[PDB]
Design an enzyme around this catalytic site. Structure first.
Site, mmCIF file in Angstrom:
data_model
loop_
_atom_site.group_PDB
_atom_site.id
_atom_site.type_symbol
_atom_site.label_atom_id
_atom_site.label_comp_id
_atom_site.label_asym_id
_atom_site.label_seq_id
_atom_site.Cartn_x
_atom_site.Cartn_y
_atom_site.Cartn_z
ATOM 1 N N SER B 49 0.838 -1.269 -0.065
ATOM 2 C CA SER B 49 -0.105 0.220 0.079
ATOM 3 C C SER B 49 0.743 1.308 -0.026
ATOM 4 O O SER B 49 0.313 2.392 -0.096
ATOM 5 C CB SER B 49 -1.085 0.022 1.265
ATOM 6 O OG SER B 49 -1.909 -1.072 1.170
ATOM 7 N N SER B 97 -6.269 2.467 3.426
ATOM 8 C CA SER B 97 -5.635 1.745 2.439
ATOM 9 C C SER B 97 -6.688 0.925 1.724
ATOM 10 O O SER B 97 -6.473 -0.311 1.719
ATOM 11 C CB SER B 97 -4.541 0.938 3.136
ATOM 12 O OG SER B 97 -3.493 1.279 3.254
ATOM 13 N N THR B 188 1.346 3.432 5.477
ATOM 14 C CA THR B 188 1.759 2.205 6.014
ATOM 15 C C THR B 188 1.662 1.175 4.841
ATOM 16 O O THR B 188 0.942 1.599 3.640
ATOM 17 C CB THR B 188 0.970 1.607 7.162
ATOM 18 O OG1 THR B 188 -0.537 1.988 6.613
ATOM 19 C CG2 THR B 188 1.051 2.459 8.392
ATOM 20 N N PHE B 190 1.553 -3.392 3.921
ATOM 21 C CA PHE B 190 1.601 -4.777 4.401
ATOM 22 C C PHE B 190 1.067 -5.752 3.360
ATOM 23 O O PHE B 190 0.059 -5.752 2.742
ATOM 24 C CB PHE B 190 0.763 -5.072 5.618
ATOM 25 C CG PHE B 190 0.606 -6.211 6.189
ATOM 26 C CD1 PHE B 190 1.677 -7.036 6.485
ATOM 27 C CD2 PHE B 190 -0.762 -6.779 6.379
ATOM 28 C CE1 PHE B 190 1.565 -8.412 6.780
ATOM 29 C CE2 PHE B 190 -0.713 -8.029 7.117
ATOM 30 C CZ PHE B 190 0.267 -8.942 7.326
ATOM 31 N N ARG B 232 5.801 -2.044 12.995
ATOM 32 C CA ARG B 232 6.134 -1.247 11.739
ATOM 33 C C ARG B 232 5.984 0.165 12.218
ATOM 34 O O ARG B 232 6.662 0.973 11.309
ATOM 35 C CB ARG B 232 5.096 -1.305 10.585
ATOM 36 C CG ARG B 232 3.845 -1.024 10.656
ATOM 37 C CD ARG B 232 2.724 -1.206 9.496
ATOM 38 N NE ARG B 232 1.658 -1.108 9.538
ATOM 39 C CZ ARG B 232 0.741 -1.462 8.711
ATOM 40 N NH1 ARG B 232 0.982 -1.778 7.494
ATOM 41 N NH2 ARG B 232 -0.614 -1.329 9.209
#
Lengths: 244, 247
Positions: B49, B97, B188, B190, B232
């Site tokens: 993302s 996201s 962020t 993932f 993170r």
């Protein structure tokens, strides 16, 4: 149209505060307030004037661009937090009056007058001294007018480039949450004088989901210890409305 | 950037959480960077993302996305996540996201234009093969932490090959923390828990504006279990707090 909302009165009474809160959802065409009369009463804008001043500074080129650093010449300034180099956001966030006084001086009376007319900014009275009209001059603007002005900014409809409006909007962000975003600016004219208290402000808007809320709050103030109320009263009202 | 130096002491936060990863922090004024591991700082991983940053810029530049006030309406169809089942603004889609919103954007942008922009942006290995709507999720696109900070610095300075107006729109949408003394813009990422012996990757990239200084950062770590996801943000945050940047 401005409608009275008597459910916020308690928030003012609890603190024995004389003031007004204006909240408009989606647009300024329909705003709610605790006091119809005070909602449209014009008051000295104090530091909330840094919003139009920043826009005008960028539009006229006085402020080169968003990355402009306002250098401190080392001369004494009213507050220690102003005695240092500042970015536009930095100057707005700590309300560094001297930085904006110089901006106003460079903008000049003619251009300043022209832009406040374009912005429909209160009574548009800038007389008495180009570097202090919003601090102790005759300039006056109401809570409703503040919301209208902020709504134009949000929509990029003020008479300035979208680029410059975006620059000022980023400098106004004061709270970021995954749910909502708050842009705002405080103001405090001072403790006023005998029987004529000063005024304290908190204006801005909240972007939540696909909805937007414009707000403007001002109150009478004669003691600096009451200053925090300019944010707590509006914040409580907006929280109870489930906005923030 | 002008220089990079290795600071192995930053491995502390990594070792404590039994995490394999890297953090890159660059100071704008001095144009110098620091990282806990030079090798991993240059290793390229799926952007996941974090690709929403260039994707949003490209969508705006191509006109696919009208502006920051455009509302991406939910058609009611079930989405991988409950948080995506609602109308969203550009910022809304970026903050949660919402992958489906950006896959649609990518499809409208098309491979030819997408390729053109990633070349202009010098974005990673610029390999977008394997489906126009998933090359950044499970395709061959790879980018390193150093490349991420280089890219972000360009965005910050409005030096990417896009209108300043569009770069400003995206920058506004990336604000994640606001304080009087500092503003944080971040995103962020993932990719998933990956396979056995081949963990997925988790990212946190952005920049911090404090005083007149600006710090660009990029963090990524190996991850094979979602319970470790909060790391993170906590590891990079602890490092930057120790540096006296945020908090």
């Amino acid at each position: 149209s401005i409608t009275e909302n008597t459910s916020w009165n308690k928030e003012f009474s609890a603190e024995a505060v004389n003031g007004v809160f204006v909240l408009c959802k989606s647009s300024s065409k329909s705003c709610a307030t605790n006091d119809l009369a005070r909602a449209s009463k014009e008051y000295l804008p104090a530091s909330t004037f840094k919003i139009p001043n920043a826009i005008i500074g960028l539009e006229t080129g006085v402020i080169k661009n968003e990355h402009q650093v306002f250098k401190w010449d080392g001369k004494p300034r009213a507050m220690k937090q102003w005695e240092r180099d500042l970015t536009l956001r930095g100057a707005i966030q700590v309300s560094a009056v001297p930085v904006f006084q110089q901006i106003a001086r460079e903008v000049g009376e003619v251009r300043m007058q022209k832009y406040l007319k374009k912005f429909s900014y209160g009574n548009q009275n800038i007389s008495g001294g180009i570097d202090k009209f919003w601090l102790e001059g005759q300039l006056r603007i109401s809570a409703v007018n503040q919301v209208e002005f902020l709504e134009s900014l949000y929509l990029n409809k003020l008479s300035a480039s979208k680029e410059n409006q975006l620059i000022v909007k980023e400098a106004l962000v004061t709270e970021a949450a995954p749910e909502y975003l708050v842009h705002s600016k405080t103001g405090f004219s001072g403790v006023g004088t005998e029987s004529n208290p000063g005024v304290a402000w908190w204006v801005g808007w909240v972007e939540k989901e696909t909805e937007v809320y414009f707000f403007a709050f001002n109150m009478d103030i004669d003691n600096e210890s009451k200053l925090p109320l300019r944010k707590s009263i509006p914040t409580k009202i907006m929280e109870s409305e489930g906005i923030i």
